[PDB]
């Protein structure tokens, strides 16, 4: 939503680490400083990797965010991201996010990163058919059936998981970079129809 009157940053963003992130972004001197919606509208990029953030509550008030770097934090719930319709790049590596339902309406999202999140179920990704780059390395994924729906993918990382069947990737004609090392892959027939692969990693398969 939006704030109708001047309001302290700390009152909008509960998480102290995140409040500090917003403070620096807006070049304000303190999280106790009052901000307006006009100022919040100016935010289109949040760089907060390894910033000890546990909750991004308050981010709902930043309608123009297109890039969000939140790698290495303490995130679990990303429901506050639900209506950030302009989100194009979303990096959430090294967190503990498993509920991907909040991403279902992010129809402009082109790059998504969720490595090291302990994820096993990615069926929620079906709602991001426009996705171009997807990083899911170092998780506990076995079933990648849903990926057959992400036909726009040109970059896909599924390294260090528990995948055996890559048939779901057979129809992803746009794939240029495919990282599949450290899985349980034996059958590579699925790659017979891929014509644009430039980078392909398949080493260290445990069968
Ligand atoms: Ca607080
Ligand atoms: Ca600072």
Curated annotation (Swiss-Prot):
Disruption phenotype: Deletion of both inlA and inlB prevents uptake of Listeria by human enterocyte-like cell line Caco-2. Single inlB deletion no longer invades various cell lines. Decreased synthesis of phosphatidylinositol 3,4,5-trisphosphate (PIP3) in green monkey cells, decreased infection of host cells, decreased association of host PI3-kinase catalytic subunit with tyrosine-phosphorylated proteins. Deletion no longer Tyr-phosphorylates mammalian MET. Residues 1-41 form the LRRNT domain. Ca(2+) 2 binds at residues 20, 24. GO terms for biological process: entry of bacterium into host cell. It is found in: Secreted; Cell surface; Cell membrane. Its main location: secreted. GO terms for cellular component: cell surface; extracellular region; peptidoglycan-based cell wall; plasma membrane. One of its GO terms (molecular function) is lipid binding. The keyword Disulfide bond does not apply. LRR repeats lie at residues 40-62, 63-86, 88-106, 107-128, 129-152, 154-172, 173-196. Ca(2+) 1 binds at residues 14, 16. Coiled coil: none annotated. Keywords: Calcium, Cell membrane, Heparin-binding, Leucine-rich repeat, Lipid-binding, Membrane, Metal-binding, Repeat, Secreted, Signal, Virulence. Has an N-terminal region with 8 leucine-rich repeats (LRR) and has 3 GW repeats in the C-terminus. Residues 241-319 form an Ig-like region, followed by a 72 residue-long flexible B repeat region. The GW repeats mediate non-covalent binding of the protein to lipoteichoic acid (LTA) on the bacterial membrane. The GW domain mediates binding to host complement component 1 Q subcomponent-binding protein (gC1q-R, C1QBP) and to heparin; heparin binding dissociates InlB from the bacterial surface. The LRR domain forms a curved tube, the N-terminus of which has a cap that binds 2 Ca(2+) ions. Belongs to the internalin family. Mediates the entry of L.monocytogenes into normally non-phagocytic mammalian host cells. Its host receptor is hepatocyte growth factor receptor (HGF receptor, a tyrosine kinase, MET) which is tyrosine-phosphorylated in response to InlB in human, green monkey, mouse and dog cell lines. Downstream adapter proteins GAB1 and CBL are phosphorylated in response to InlB, which also causes cell colony scattering. InlB binding to mammalian cells is saturable and inhibited by EDTA; InlB-coated beads can be taken up by host cells. Monomer. Interacts via its LRR repeats with the extracellular portion of mammalian host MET; MET can bind HGF, its endogenous ligand, and InlB simultaneously. Probably forms a dimer upon interaction with host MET, which subsequently allows dimerization of the host MET and subsequent host signaling; dimerization probably occurs via the convex surface of InlB. Interacts with host complement component 1 Q subcomponent-binding protein (C1QBP). Interacts in vitro with human intestinal mucin-2 (MUC2) but not with mucin-1. This is Internalin B. It comes from Listeria monocytogenes serotype 1/2a (strain EGD / Mackaness). The lineage of its organism: Bacteria, Bacillati, Bacillota, Bacilli, Bacillales.
């Amino acid at each position: 939503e939006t704030i109708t009157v001047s309001t302290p940053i700390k009152q909008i963003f509960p998480d102290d680490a995140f409040a500090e992130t917003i403070k620096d972004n807006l070049k304000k001197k303190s999280v106790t400083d009052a901000v307006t919606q006009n100022e919040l509208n100016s935010i289109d990029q949040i760089i907060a990797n390894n910033s000890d953030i546990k909750s991004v509550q308050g981010i709902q008030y930043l309608p123009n965010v297109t890039k969000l770097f939140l790698n290495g934090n303490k995130l679990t719930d990303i429901k506050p991201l639900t209506n950030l319709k302009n989100l194009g790049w979303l990096f959430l590596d090294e967190n503990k996010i498993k509920d991907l339902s909040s991403l279902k309406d992010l129809k402009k999202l082109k790059s998504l990163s969720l490595e090291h999140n302990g994820i096993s179920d990615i069926n929620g990704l079906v709602h991001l058919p426009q996705l171009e780059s997807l990083y899911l390395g170092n998780n506990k994924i076995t079933d990648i059936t849903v990926l057959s729906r992400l036909t726009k993918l040109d970059t896909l990382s599924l390294e260090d998981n528990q995948i055996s069947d890559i048939v779901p990737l057979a129809g992803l004609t746009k794939l240029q970079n495919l990282y599949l090392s450290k899985n349980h892959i034996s059958d590579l027939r699925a790659l017979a129809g891929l014509k644009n692969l430039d980078v392909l990693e398949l080493f260290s398969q445990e069968c």
